[PDB]
Amino acid sequence: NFEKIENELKEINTNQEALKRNFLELTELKFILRKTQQFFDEMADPDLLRLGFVAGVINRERIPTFERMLWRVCRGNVFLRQAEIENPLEDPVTGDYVHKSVFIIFFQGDQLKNRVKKICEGFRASLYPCPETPQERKEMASGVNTRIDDLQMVLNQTEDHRQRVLQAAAKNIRVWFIK
């Protein structure tokens, strides 16, 4: 009884962290996917390989230094854009709710790609994969919109299972301890 109780507790505890991380990642990806189309909101005439493109999210109070460092390392021609993501969102690894800005960078080739990705990783941002075309955007949007709800569902049900089993343990632990 003790072995099973503690083992199931350990397993759920461990799995909860991974599910939390993935759910938060997918939430941030969903937000970025949302704002990307607004960034394309000029004129939709087209029905739907030299410019490279990346996107991610940063914390506030970094934005000006980050922007100027990009502008200084890749002088005058790394096209960075950004916008606010209202309401905080937990950092999956840092574990802090903090104000966030979604950001994009466009570049011309491999040499600039290297610098951009390296400076991003140095500033410890979060990129996640991003699309290039409207149908890719819809694919990713649906893929994250199902998975976020799925992971939230399983997280909540498994936490309820934690509650049930932990109540069952606490109801009897003192007698278990004494025995």
Partner: protein
């Protein structure tokens, strides 16, 4: 700022223009070279086959 935006965009359009120009001229030179050398190849081998025939 707006000045930065317009100047940066001007520079990027100029550089993509010149990148396209470079690729176009490079493919032009390669197409001409391969035009000449494909003439060489085909003409020479087929003419040598004709040499053997005659």
């Amino acid at each position: 700022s707006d000045a930065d935006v317009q100047k940066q965009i001007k520079h990027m359009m100029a550089f993509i223009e010149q990148e396209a120009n470079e690729k176009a001229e490079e493919i032009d030179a390669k197409a001409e070279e391969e035009f000449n050398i494909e003439k060489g190849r085909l003409v020479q081998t087929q003419r040598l086959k004709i040499m053997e025939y005659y």
